[PDB]
Short mmCIF file of C-alpha atoms and ligand atoms in Angstrom, two decimals:
data_model
loop_
_atom_site.label_atom_id
_atom_site.label_comp_id
_atom_site.label_asym_id
_atom_site.label_seq_id
_atom_site.Cartn_x
_atom_site.Cartn_y
_atom_site.Cartn_z
CA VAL A 1 112.05 6.48 6.46
CA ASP A 2 113.24 4.13 3.65
CA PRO A 3 111.56 0.70 3.97
CA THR A 4 114.45 -0.94 1.92
CA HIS A 5 117.04 0.28 4.56
CA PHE A 6 117.74 -2.40 7.21
CA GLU A 7 119.75 -1.11 10.20
CA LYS A 8 122.44 -3.59 11.30
CA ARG A 9 121.66 -3.04 15.04
CA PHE A 10 118.14 -4.63 14.55
CA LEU A 11 119.14 -7.55 12.18
CA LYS A 12 119.48 -10.57 14.52
CA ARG A 13 121.30 -13.54 12.96
CA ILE A 14 119.42 -16.90 13.56
CA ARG A 15 121.13 -19.57 11.39
CA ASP A 16 122.81 -20.35 8.09
CA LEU A 17 120.56 -21.33 5.10
CA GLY A 18 123.41 -21.66 2.62
CA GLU A 19 127.15 -21.38 2.31
CA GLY A 20 129.52 -21.07 -0.69
CA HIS A 21 133.30 -20.50 -1.04
CA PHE A 22 133.01 -16.67 -0.54
CA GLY A 23 129.69 -15.92 1.20
CA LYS A 24 126.52 -17.16 2.86
CA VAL A 25 122.78 -16.76 3.02
CA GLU A 26 121.51 -16.57 6.65
CA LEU A 27 118.07 -16.57 8.32
CA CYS A 28 117.74 -13.33 10.32
CA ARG A 29 114.96 -11.64 12.22
CA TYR A 30 114.66 -7.86 11.58
CA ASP A 31 113.44 -6.78 15.06
CA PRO A 32 113.41 -3.00 15.56
CA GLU A 33 110.92 -3.33 18.52
CA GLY A 34 113.28 -5.79 20.35
CA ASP A 35 110.45 -8.24 21.32
CA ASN A 36 110.87 -10.96 18.54
CA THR A 37 107.76 -9.79 16.61
CA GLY A 38 109.83 -8.60 13.59
CA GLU A 39 109.82 -10.37 10.22
CA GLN A 40 112.17 -13.26 9.29
CA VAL A 41 114.36 -12.36 6.25
CA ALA A 42 117.02 -14.19 4.17
CA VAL A 43 120.34 -12.27 4.20
CA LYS A 44 123.15 -12.71 1.65
CA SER A 45 126.61 -11.47 2.63
CA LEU A 46 130.35 -12.04 2.00
CA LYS A 47 132.84 -13.81 4.33
CA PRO A 48 135.49 -11.42 5.74
CA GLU A 49 138.03 -13.08 3.26
CA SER A 50 136.80 -11.46 -0.11
CA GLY A 51 139.12 -10.64 -3.14
CA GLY A 52 138.86 -10.18 -6.98
CA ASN A 53 135.84 -8.34 -6.58
CA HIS A 54 133.38 -10.59 -4.76
CA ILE A 55 132.12 -7.18 -3.36
CA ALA A 56 131.65 -5.73 -6.90
CA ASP A 57 129.83 -8.96 -7.95
CA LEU A 58 127.49 -8.88 -4.89
CA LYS A 59 126.70 -5.19 -5.54
CA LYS A 60 125.82 -6.22 -9.14
CA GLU A 61 123.67 -9.11 -7.89
CA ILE A 62 121.77 -6.64 -5.63
CA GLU A 63 121.04 -4.31 -8.64
CA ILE A 64 119.94 -7.33 -10.75
CA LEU A 65 117.50 -8.69 -8.16
CA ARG A 66 116.17 -5.19 -7.03
CA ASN A 67 114.92 -4.59 -10.64
CA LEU A 68 113.39 -8.09 -11.28
CA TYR A 69 109.56 -8.19 -10.72
CA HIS A 70 108.05 -11.66 -11.45
CA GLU A 71 105.78 -13.90 -9.33
CA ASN A 72 108.34 -16.78 -9.89
CA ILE A 73 111.41 -14.76 -8.72
CA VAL A 74 112.17 -14.31 -4.98
CA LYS A 75 111.39 -10.79 -3.68
CA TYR A 76 114.12 -8.21 -2.93
CA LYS A 77 113.36 -6.41 0.41
CA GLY A 78 116.47 -4.18 0.89
CA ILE A 79 120.06 -3.77 1.92
CA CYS A 80 122.08 -3.43 5.11
CA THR A 81 125.37 -1.33 4.86
CA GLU A 82 128.16 -2.07 7.49
CA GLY A 83 130.47 -4.22 3.42
CA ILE A 84 126.83 -4.74 2.22
CA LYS A 85 124.12 -7.35 2.81
CA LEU A 86 121.26 -8.30 0.40
CA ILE A 87 117.92 -8.74 2.26
CA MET A 88 115.29 -11.04 0.63
CA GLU A 89 111.97 -12.55 1.68
CA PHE A 90 112.25 -15.78 3.68
CA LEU A 91 110.41 -18.84 2.35
CA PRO A 92 110.14 -21.26 5.28
CA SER A 93 109.37 -24.29 2.98
CA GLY A 94 112.88 -23.96 1.52
CA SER A 95 114.11 -25.34 -1.82
CA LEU A 96 112.62 -28.22 -3.82
CA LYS A 97 115.56 -30.24 -2.44
CA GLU A 98 114.08 -29.79 1.13
CA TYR A 99 110.40 -29.74 0.24
CA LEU A 100 109.83 -32.53 -2.36
CA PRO A 101 111.20 -35.49 -0.32
CA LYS A 102 108.80 -34.62 2.57
CA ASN A 103 105.70 -33.96 0.36
CA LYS A 104 105.70 -36.75 -2.29
CA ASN A 105 102.20 -37.83 -1.18
CA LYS A 106 100.67 -34.39 -1.96
CA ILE A 107 102.79 -33.39 -5.06
CA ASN A 108 101.56 -35.44 -8.11
CA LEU A 109 102.65 -35.24 -11.78
CA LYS A 110 100.14 -32.41 -12.53
CA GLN A 111 101.66 -30.31 -9.66
CA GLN A 112 105.18 -31.18 -10.91
CA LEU A 113 104.31 -29.91 -14.45
CA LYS A 114 102.83 -26.72 -12.87
CA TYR A 115 106.14 -26.14 -11.05
CA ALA A 116 107.97 -26.79 -14.33
CA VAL A 117 105.85 -24.11 -16.06
CA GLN A 118 106.54 -21.57 -13.31
CA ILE A 119 110.32 -22.22 -13.44
CA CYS A 120 110.19 -21.74 -17.28
CA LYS A 121 108.24 -18.42 -16.84
CA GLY A 122 110.79 -17.01 -14.38
CA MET A 123 113.68 -18.12 -16.60
CA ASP A 124 112.05 -16.70 -19.74
CA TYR A 125 111.56 -13.37 -17.86
CA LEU A 126 115.31 -13.40 -16.89
CA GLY A 127 116.31 -14.19 -20.56
CA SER A 128 114.11 -11.31 -21.84
CA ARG A 129 116.28 -8.97 -19.58
CA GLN A 130 119.47 -10.34 -21.28
CA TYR A 131 120.54 -12.44 -18.22
CA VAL A 132 122.02 -15.97 -18.07
CA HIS A 133 121.50 -17.57 -14.60
CA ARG A 134 124.30 -20.20 -14.75
CA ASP A 135 123.13 -22.11 -11.62
CA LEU A 136 119.57 -23.37 -12.27
CA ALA A 137 119.19 -26.44 -10.03
CA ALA A 138 116.42 -27.63 -7.62
CA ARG A 139 118.47 -26.30 -4.63
CA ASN A 140 117.87 -22.74 -6.07
CA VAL A 141 114.05 -23.14 -6.64
CA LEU A 142 112.18 -22.11 -3.49
CA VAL A 143 108.65 -23.25 -2.45
CA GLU A 144 106.32 -20.31 -1.68
CA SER A 145 103.30 -22.63 -1.18
CA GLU A 146 102.15 -26.04 -2.44
CA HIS A 147 100.99 -24.19 -5.62
CA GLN A 148 103.93 -21.72 -6.28
CA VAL A 149 107.73 -21.82 -6.72
CA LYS A 150 110.27 -19.01 -7.19
CA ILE A 151 113.87 -18.93 -8.43
CA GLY A 152 115.62 -17.99 -5.14
CA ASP A 153 119.33 -17.31 -5.81
CA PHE A 154 121.20 -15.17 -8.36
CA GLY A 155 124.84 -15.57 -7.15
CA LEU A 156 126.20 -16.54 -10.65
CA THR A 157 123.73 -14.42 -12.77
CA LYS A 158 125.46 -12.38 -15.58
CA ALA A 159 124.35 -9.83 -18.20
CA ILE A 160 124.85 -10.95 -21.87
CA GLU A 161 126.25 -7.87 -23.70
CA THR A 162 123.76 -6.28 -26.28
CA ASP A 163 124.54 -7.89 -29.79
CA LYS A 164 126.29 -10.95 -28.13
CA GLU A 165 124.80 -14.54 -27.63
CA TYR A 166 126.87 -15.65 -24.62
CA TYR A 167 128.94 -14.67 -21.60
CA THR A 168 132.50 -16.03 -21.27
CA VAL A 169 133.32 -17.24 -17.67
CA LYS A 170 136.73 -16.98 -15.93
CA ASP A 171 136.16 -17.99 -12.26
CA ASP A 172 134.91 -21.61 -12.74
CA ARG A 173 136.63 -23.86 -10.07
CA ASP A 174 133.28 -24.16 -8.16
CA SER A 175 131.07 -24.89 -11.33
CA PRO A 176 128.01 -27.21 -10.81
CA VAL A 177 129.30 -29.42 -13.68
CA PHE A 178 126.52 -32.09 -13.55
CA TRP A 179 124.01 -29.31 -14.55
CA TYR A 180 126.22 -27.75 -17.25
CA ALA A 181 125.84 -27.91 -21.04
CA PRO A 182 128.86 -29.13 -23.11
CA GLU A 183 129.75 -25.56 -24.33
CA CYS A 184 129.97 -24.46 -20.66
CA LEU A 185 132.24 -27.48 -19.78
CA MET A 186 134.39 -27.27 -22.95
CA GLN A 187 134.72 -23.43 -23.53
CA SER A 188 133.30 -21.68 -20.38
CA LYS A 189 130.70 -20.00 -22.73
CA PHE A 190 127.21 -19.48 -21.25
CA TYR A 191 124.18 -18.95 -23.58
CA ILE A 192 120.47 -18.73 -22.73
CA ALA A 193 120.32 -22.25 -24.35
CA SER A 194 122.85 -23.21 -21.60
CA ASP A 195 120.18 -22.30 -19.00
CA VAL A 196 117.68 -24.52 -21.04
CA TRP A 197 120.09 -27.49 -20.58
CA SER A 198 120.23 -26.73 -16.77
CA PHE A 199 116.40 -26.59 -16.73
CA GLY A 200 116.19 -30.10 -18.18
CA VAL A 201 118.46 -31.31 -15.32
CA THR A 202 116.34 -29.43 -12.77
CA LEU A 203 113.20 -31.04 -14.32
CA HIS A 204 114.78 -34.51 -13.85
CA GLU A 205 115.38 -33.54 -10.13
CA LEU A 206 111.74 -32.41 -9.78
CA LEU A 207 110.50 -35.72 -11.34
CA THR A 208 112.77 -37.73 -8.89
CA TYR A 209 111.47 -35.66 -5.90
CA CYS A 210 115.12 -34.56 -5.37
CA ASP A 211 116.06 -38.00 -3.92
CA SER A 212 119.85 -37.97 -3.25
CA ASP A 213 120.37 -41.48 -4.80
CA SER A 214 118.77 -40.20 -8.10
CA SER A 215 120.63 -36.83 -8.15
CA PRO A 216 122.33 -35.75 -11.40
CA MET A 217 125.74 -36.15 -9.59
CA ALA A 218 124.97 -39.70 -8.31
CA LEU A 219 123.61 -40.80 -11.73
CA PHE A 220 126.45 -39.27 -13.83
CA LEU A 221 129.14 -40.64 -11.41
CA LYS A 222 127.50 -44.12 -11.81
CA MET A 223 127.79 -43.72 -15.67
CA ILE A 224 131.39 -42.38 -15.77
CA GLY A 225 132.85 -43.82 -12.47
CA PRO A 226 133.39 -41.92 -9.16
CA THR A 227 137.21 -42.37 -8.78
CA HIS A 228 138.51 -40.08 -11.64
CA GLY A 229 139.39 -36.93 -9.59
CA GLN A 230 140.76 -34.09 -11.88
CA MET A 231 139.68 -36.23 -14.99
CA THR A 232 135.93 -36.25 -14.00
CA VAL A 233 134.86 -33.28 -16.18
CA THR A 234 136.60 -34.53 -19.43
CA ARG A 235 135.04 -38.00 -18.88
CA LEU A 236 131.65 -36.24 -18.40
CA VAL A 237 132.19 -34.31 -21.70
CA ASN A 238 133.11 -37.58 -23.51
CA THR A 239 129.94 -39.35 -22.16
CA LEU A 240 127.77 -36.42 -23.41
CA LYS A 241 129.61 -36.37 -26.83
CA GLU A 242 128.72 -40.10 -27.19
CA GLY A 243 125.06 -39.09 -26.58
CA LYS A 244 124.49 -40.61 -23.10
CA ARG A 245 121.91 -38.71 -21.02
CA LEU A 246 120.28 -38.99 -17.61
CA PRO A 247 117.70 -41.81 -17.88
CA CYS A 248 113.88 -41.43 -17.78
CA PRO A 249 112.81 -41.02 -14.13
CA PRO A 250 110.62 -43.72 -12.60
CA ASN A 251 106.93 -43.13 -13.45
CA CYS A 252 107.85 -40.25 -15.85
CA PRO A 253 105.74 -40.63 -19.02
CA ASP A 254 107.66 -40.71 -22.34
CA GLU A 255 105.92 -37.48 -23.47
CA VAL A 256 107.50 -35.58 -20.48
CA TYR A 257 110.88 -37.35 -21.00
CA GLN A 258 110.87 -36.16 -24.67
CA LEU A 259 110.52 -32.46 -23.60
CA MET A 260 113.43 -33.03 -21.15
CA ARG A 261 115.57 -34.59 -23.97
CA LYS A 262 114.97 -31.48 -26.18
CA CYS A 263 116.81 -29.53 -23.42
CA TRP A 264 119.93 -31.75 -23.93
CA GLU A 265 120.69 -31.43 -27.66
CA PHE A 266 124.51 -31.27 -27.88
CA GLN A 267 124.45 -28.06 -30.04
CA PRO A 268 122.80 -25.06 -28.29
CA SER A 269 121.13 -23.96 -31.55
CA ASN A 270 119.18 -27.35 -31.69
CA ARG A 271 117.74 -27.10 -28.12
CA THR A 272 114.11 -26.19 -27.34
CA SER A 273 113.38 -22.71 -25.84
CA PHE A 274 111.64 -21.78 -22.49
CA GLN A 275 108.51 -20.57 -24.46
CA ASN A 276 108.40 -23.99 -26.32
CA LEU A 277 108.68 -25.88 -23.03
CA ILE A 278 105.79 -23.78 -21.49
CA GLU A 279 103.59 -24.68 -24.54
CA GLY A 280 104.56 -28.41 -24.25
CA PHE A 281 103.75 -28.56 -20.47
CA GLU A 282 100.48 -26.59 -20.97
CA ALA A 283 99.40 -29.12 -23.71
CA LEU A 284 100.04 -31.96 -21.21
CA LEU A 285 98.03 -30.18 -18.43
CA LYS A 286 95.02 -29.20 -20.73
N1 KH8 B 1 117.17 -20.30 -3.52
C1 KH8 B 1 117.71 -20.90 -2.68
C2 KH8 B 1 118.46 -21.58 -1.64
C3 KH8 B 1 118.94 -20.66 -0.51
N2 KH8 B 1 117.77 -20.20 0.23
C4 KH8 B 1 117.17 -19.01 0.19
C5 KH8 B 1 116.06 -19.07 1.05
C6 KH8 B 1 115.04 -18.08 1.37
N3 KH8 B 1 115.01 -16.91 0.72
O1 KH8 B 1 114.15 -18.37 2.14
C7 KH8 B 1 116.11 -20.39 1.59
N4 KH8 B 1 115.20 -20.95 2.52
C8 KH8 B 1 115.36 -22.06 3.30
O2 KH8 B 1 116.33 -22.80 3.17
C9 KH8 B 1 114.27 -22.32 4.27
C10 KH8 B 1 113.95 -23.77 4.58
C11 KH8 B 1 114.60 -22.92 5.60
N5 KH8 B 1 117.14 -21.04 1.09
C12 KH8 B 1 119.85 -21.48 0.42
C13 KH8 B 1 121.17 -21.86 -0.25
N6 KH8 B 1 121.92 -20.66 -0.70
C14 KH8 B 1 123.19 -21.06 -1.34
C15 KH8 B 1 124.12 -19.91 -1.62
C16 KH8 B 1 124.94 -19.38 -0.65
C17 KH8 B 1 125.76 -18.28 -0.93
C18 KH8 B 1 125.74 -17.63 -2.17
C19 KH8 B 1 126.54 -16.39 -2.37
C20 KH8 B 1 126.77 -15.52 -1.30
C21 KH8 B 1 127.53 -14.36 -1.46
C22 KH8 B 1 128.00 -13.99 -2.71
C23 KH8 B 1 127.83 -14.86 -3.76
C24 KH8 B 1 127.11 -16.06 -3.59
C25 KH8 B 1 124.85 -18.14 -3.12
O3 KH8 B 1 124.77 -17.57 -4.39
C26 KH8 B 1 124.07 -19.25 -2.84
C27 KH8 B 1 121.08 -19.89 -1.63
C28 KH8 B 1 119.77 -19.47 -1.01
#
């Protein structure tokens, strides 16, 4: 009996957790005894639609996640073959975007810097395996407990070729542009330093407790104007070229803001690293 083999006839769909253009993540109960005692699991799968291989990309995502082992990376549990489904552990607290607005009273700056460290450890582990994540945002950081977070989605994750510094992207219409570094917006090139820029944005979200009126989209649309349609991304590039950045969050000390700003150097080569950030946060926690 293979414990990573989930039979479709026992995987009971409960509700949607997430939806993109091509696929979804759903809450299921795996219930082989038929009495609702089985474990809740998160299930990634494709919409019937498909195309230019969404299936090949999901199969690659499965092999990426199956072979990652880090306490700050969501746990692979198995697959279901029917078309294929990725089975992951279910974290009932959800993403930082769900959890932080409801728990501001109990999550103080120390706890925020601890989450920051754990996000940097999972990212540094992914970088060491020659992966770029390309979608690091608070909506993809899951809460295991009050004391532990995990990166919880790998839908855009790509291998950087051995002896290369970046991955060039082709399918980009659904890019999360308010988290993206200039090189990503201007040339669809994705470096590890591009994930460092996305981390700085995610840190700003963590420091604003993911409030919707302080989101990176809301704040950048206030700076550049919300009415620009197809011109939005070139206006965003121009704002960043001029050196404008997301402002210091309320109650964020300058010493934390300065680590964030090192994430947002225009040139990738000038940005801090994940291991520098961990050292910086650890000095502040000492
Ligand atoms: N991380 C994280 C956030 C998500 N999440 C996982 C769990 C869990 N494991 O528990 C969870 N938990 C809760 O919300 C509990 C409070 C109730 N939320 C929810 C949002 N989706 C967005 C999304 C959807 C589809 C694709 C996708 C599909 C097919 C092919 C390619 C791409 C994709 O890459 C990403 C990502 C996972």
